[PDB]
Enzyme design. Structure first.
Site, PDB file in Angstrom:
ATOM      1  CG  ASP A 126      -2.130  11.156  16.248  1.00  0.00           C
ATOM      2  OD1 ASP A 126      -1.612  11.845  15.511  1.00  0.00           O
ATOM      3  OD2 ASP A 126      -1.057   9.941  17.188  1.00  0.00           O
TER       4      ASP A 126
ATOM      5  CD  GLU B 217     -15.722  18.314   8.931  1.00  0.00           C
ATOM      6  OE1 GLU B 217     -13.736  18.593   8.472  1.00  0.00           O
ATOM      7  OE2 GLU B 217     -15.971  19.027   8.558  1.00  0.00           O
TER       8      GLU B 217
ATOM      9  CG  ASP C 222     -19.268  19.990   5.430  1.00  0.00           C
ATOM     10  OD1 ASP C 222     -17.833  20.187   5.646  1.00  0.00           O
ATOM     11  OD2 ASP C 222     -19.378  20.638   4.212  1.00  0.00           O
TER      12      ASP C 222
ATOM     13  CG  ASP D 167      -2.749   1.937  13.681  1.00  0.00           C
ATOM     14  OD1 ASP D 167      -2.821   2.249  12.545  1.00  0.00           O
ATOM     15  OD2 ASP D 167      -1.523   2.319  14.314  1.00  0.00           O
TER      16      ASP D 167
ATOM     17  CD  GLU E  89       4.427   7.457   8.454  1.00  0.00           C
ATOM     18  OE1 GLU E  89       3.835   6.338   7.994  1.00  0.00           O
ATOM     19  OE2 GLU E  89       4.995   7.060  10.015  1.00  0.00           O
TER      20      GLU E  89
ATOM     21  CG  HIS F 153      13.591  -0.152   6.978  1.00  0.00           C
ATOM     22  ND1 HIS F 153      13.765  -1.885   7.224  1.00  0.00           N
ATOM     23  CD2 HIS F 153      12.192   0.360   8.053  1.00  0.00           C
ATOM     24  CE1 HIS F 153      13.390  -1.963   7.751  1.00  0.00           C
ATOM     25  NE2 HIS F 153      12.493  -1.163   8.394  1.00  0.00           N
TER      26      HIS F 153
ATOM     27  CB  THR G 193      10.349   6.717  11.438  1.00  0.00           C
ATOM     28  OG1 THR G 193      10.155   6.644   9.638  1.00  0.00           O
ATOM     29  CG2 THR G 193       9.360   7.178  11.554  1.00  0.00           C
TER      30      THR G 193
ATOM     31  CD  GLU H 211       7.769  10.723  14.670  1.00  0.00           C
ATOM     32  OE1 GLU H 211       7.426   9.448  13.662  1.00  0.00           O
ATOM     33  OE2 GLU H 211       6.903  11.349  14.224  1.00  0.00           O
ATOM     34  CG  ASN H 212      10.536   5.222  18.549  1.00  0.00           C
ATOM     35  OD1 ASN H 212      10.747   6.640  18.916  1.00  0.00           O
ATOM     36  ND2 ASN H 212      10.460   3.614  19.036  1.00  0.00           N
ATOM     37  CB  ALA H 213      10.136   2.441  12.456  1.00  0.00           C
TER      38      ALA H 213
HETATM   39  O1  EBG Z   1       1.122   8.747  17.626  1.00  0.00           O
HETATM   40  C1  EBG Z   1       1.654   9.115  15.897  1.00  0.00           C
HETATM   41  C2  EBG Z   1       1.377   7.950  15.254  1.00  0.00           C
HETATM   42  O2  EBG Z   1       2.119   6.455  15.189  1.00  0.00           O
HETATM   43  C3  EBG Z   1       1.582   5.953  14.207  1.00  0.00           C
HETATM   44  O3  EBG Z   1       2.133   5.584  13.564  1.00  0.00           O
HETATM   45  C4  EBG Z   1       3.499   4.694  13.316  1.00  0.00           C
HETATM   46  C5  EBG Z   1       4.763   5.681  13.672  1.00  0.00           C
HETATM   47  C6  EBG Z   1       5.029   6.545  12.586  1.00  0.00           C
HETATM   48  C7  EBG Z   1       4.301   6.705  10.753  1.00  0.00           C
HETATM   49  O4  EBG Z   1       3.953   8.078  12.580  1.00  0.00           O
HETATM   50  C8  EBG Z   1      -0.249   5.487  14.214  1.00  0.00           C
HETATM   51  O5  EBG Z   1      -0.002   4.321  13.170  1.00  0.00           O
HETATM   52  C9  EBG Z   1      -0.143   6.849  13.355  1.00  0.00           C
HETATM   53  O6  EBG Z   1      -1.372   7.319  12.898  1.00  0.00           O
HETATM   54  C10 EBG Z   1      -0.080   8.191  14.283  1.00  0.00           C
HETATM   55  O7  EBG Z   1      -0.768   9.150  13.365  1.00  0.00           O
HETATM   56 CA    CA Z   2     -15.567  20.850   6.177  1.00  0.00          CA
END
Ligand code: EBG
Ligand code: CA
EC number: 3.2.1.2
Length: 516
Positions: A49, A56, A60, A97, A172, A292, A330, A367-369
């Site tokens: 990420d 930025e 701007d 997070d 997402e 889900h 996911t 991906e995995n949740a």
């Molecule tokens: O590191 C990748 C992503 O991982 C997580 O998402 C949860 C898993 C799915 C909903 O990408 C973070 O919350 C996102 O900010 C990040 O972009």
């Molecule tokens: Ca800009």
């Protein structure tokens, strides 16, 4: 795999990088050592990420791609590839997070009205990402950020395997319908996020554009609205989810609601392709979240998916196809429950999307949740990925396997595999007209002994007078398989007498010959 085929020959495994900057969770020298170790375990690239709030921040066009370039150098050093995520969403506030990186604060000062953020049915304001409705701001800012990012990463085009765009919250393409602050977290029903004055005007103008006048709107909806200001979004979300969604009004509102996401997809997709195509020539993708819960609720059917903007998946995927974007889904590790109070049907959802994607010829990734801490979950991902034609699987997250050789080992064995083309040959099979031959084996790649929907079909070689097939297998893994005959009516007629094996599967293409 389904339809008698095997695993996707293009399959590759990726690893999610930490949410925080490398020098904050370790150091560059060690990061490089970790990457070589990850590579050793089957991982092809690292997804990362790159936060808009970092790139930025001050103002701007006041860019700072230094971190992104430094990260890219260590990847090149470690001899790996990367998949950057242009994260135009806030880090922090979502499940798992461990960070706090909001989008640039000057961005909010660009508008006088409430066009930029979201507001729920109950009035909760969300500012994790920009409201897709403000396409003008989005066209300017994303166009500018993608172009600037392309220029800054041009020197490292060689280590970039693919680029992911952020379609919304948590990267997402969805509405921020499930949040603790809004009281809509799992497994509760979600709330619609179209309650800003800006959203109301847009729906209203969208309706009047479709019909022309209120007199026609009322005729189509069978309603009796006196003025145009009466055209508004669902006054009662739960009631709307209970039956409102069935009316012409309900069908119309949901069309607009999801449509905003489809247009957004087409927009960020065109900006991305214009920005990255000539210089990188790599695939660009976006993600659809796995909502889900409340899936099979009898009272509120899909009460969590609809508020997130997912009403018609087939129509939603058509938007990805047009925008020329690969899709990521996911929840591959989970299985169906579908019981009160959650009504969670994870595995059914995935199968649905996978079917549609493969039908539409869209490249699928998964991906995995949640963090996997057990190999049983890895096995579940394996069944889905190697049977539903996924082109790739991304593991969340770095530290989970990086500091646990046990998980790392199980991952390498089950999912960190290298697909190779091999020829399977079976001699003297007692086939009669209408008989089709198949093979099934122990690993997820061979259908896990399933003969119903996962076996791999073999074909008769007129010239060699035998049954054979070019099957994609996991290189360097021990496999056990057996061929069987399936009759015209679809039932197993007989099985190969002795169980066959390949210990291990050769790293180079060749053939395995056995007799019935
Ligand atoms: O590191 C990748 C992503 O991982 C997580 O998402 C949860 C898993 C799915 C909903 O990408 C973070 O919350 C996102 O900010 C990040 O972009
Ligand atoms: Ca800009």
């Amino acid at each position: 795999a389904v339809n008698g085929k095997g695993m996707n020959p293009d399959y590759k495994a990726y690893l999610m990088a930490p949410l925080k900057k490398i020098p904050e969770v370790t150091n560059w020298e060690t990061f490089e050592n970790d990457l070589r170790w990850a590579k050793q375990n089957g991982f092809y690239a690292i997804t990362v990420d790159f936060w808009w709030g970092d790139m930025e921040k001050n103002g701007d066009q006041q860019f700072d791609f230094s971190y992104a370039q430094r990260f890219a150098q260590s990847v090149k050093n470690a001899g790996m590839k990367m998949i950057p995520i242009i994260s135009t969403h806030q880090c922090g506030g979502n499940v798992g997070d461990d960070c706090n990186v909001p989008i640039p604060s000057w961005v909010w000062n660009q508008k006088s009205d409430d066009s930029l953020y979201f507001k729920s049915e109950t009035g909760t304001v969300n500012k994790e990402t920009l409201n897709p409705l403000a396409s003008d701001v989005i066209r300017k800012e994303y166009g500018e950020l993608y172009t600037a990012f392309a220029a800054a990463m041009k020197p490292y085009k060689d280590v970039i395997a693919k680029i992911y765009l952020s379609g919304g919250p948590a990267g997402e393409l969805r509405y921020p319908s499930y949040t603790t602050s809004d009281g809509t977290g799992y497994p509760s029903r979600g709330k619609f996020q179209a309650y800003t004055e800006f959203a109301k005007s847009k729906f209203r103008l969208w309706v009047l554009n479709k019909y022309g006048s209120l007199n026609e709107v009322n005729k189509a909806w069978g309603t009796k609205l006196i003025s145009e200001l009466a055209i508004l979004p669902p006054s009662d979300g739960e009631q709307f989810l209970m039956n409102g969604y069935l009316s012409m009004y309900g069908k119309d509102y949901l069309e607009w609601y999801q449509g905003i996401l489809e247009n957004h997809t087409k927009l960020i997709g065109e900006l991305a392709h214009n920005a990255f195509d000539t210089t990188f020539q790599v695939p660009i993708g976006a993600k659809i979240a796995g909502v889900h819960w409340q899936y099979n609720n009898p009272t509120i059917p899909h009460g969590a998916e609809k508020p997130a903007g997912y009403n018609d998946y087939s129509h939603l995927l058509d938007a990805f196809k047009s925008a020329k974007l690969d899709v990521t889904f996911t929840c591959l590790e989970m299985t169906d429950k579908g019981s009160y109070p959650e009504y969670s049907m994870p595995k059914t959802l995935v199968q649905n999307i996978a079917t549609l994607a493969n039908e539409k010829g869209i490249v699928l990734n998964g991906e995995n949740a949640l963090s996997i801490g057990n190999e049983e979950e890895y096995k579940r991902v394996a069944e889905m990925a190697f049977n539903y034609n996924f082109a790739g699987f991304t593991l969340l997250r770095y530290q989970d396997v990086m500091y646990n050789n046990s998980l790392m080992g199980k991952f390498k064995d089950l999912l960190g595999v290298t697909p190779v083309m091999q020829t399977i040959v079976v001699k003297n099979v007692p086939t009669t007209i209408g008989d089709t031959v198949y093979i099934t084996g122990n690993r997820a790649e061979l259908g896990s002994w399933d003969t119903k929907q996962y076996p791999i079909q073999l074909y008769y070689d007129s010239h060699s007078n035998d049954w054979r097939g070019n099957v994609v297998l996991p290189a360097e893994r021990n496999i056990e398989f057996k061929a069987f005959i399936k009759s015209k009516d679809g039932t197993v007629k007989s099985w190969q007498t002795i169980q066959q094996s390949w210990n291990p599967v050769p790293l180079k293409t060749t053939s395995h010959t056995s007799s019935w």
